[PDB]
């Protein structure tokens, strides 16, 4: 889904949603991948989109 996910993320960003995805937050994710993931897993307010 990587190719489609790029379009989906662009669509979300244009509509003003702050989408966190690995390919875009590469610099921050690079510091600590597991910490990066747990950042969005812990937060109850973050809506997680599952690309089936």
């Amino acid at each position: 889904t990587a190719m489609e996910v790029v379009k989906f993320v662009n669509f979300l960003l244009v509509n003003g949603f702050q989408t966190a995805i690995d390919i875009f937050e590469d610099r921050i994710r690079g510091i600590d991948i597991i910490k990066w993931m747990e950042r969005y897993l812990r937060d109850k307010t973050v809506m997680i989109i599952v690309a089936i």
């Binding site: 790029v6 379009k7 662009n10 669509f11 244009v14």
Partner: protein, 41 residues
Amino acid sequence: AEEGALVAAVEPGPLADGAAVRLALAGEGEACPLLGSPGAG
């Protein structure tokens, strides 16, 4: 004594109606992202 009482039919008087409210999004688009940098030899 047939004049004791009468049968009565009940109706709901003050009926009212209304339309459903639906939401829509105005306009759509997508700005392209940027990517890439050249390799070297």
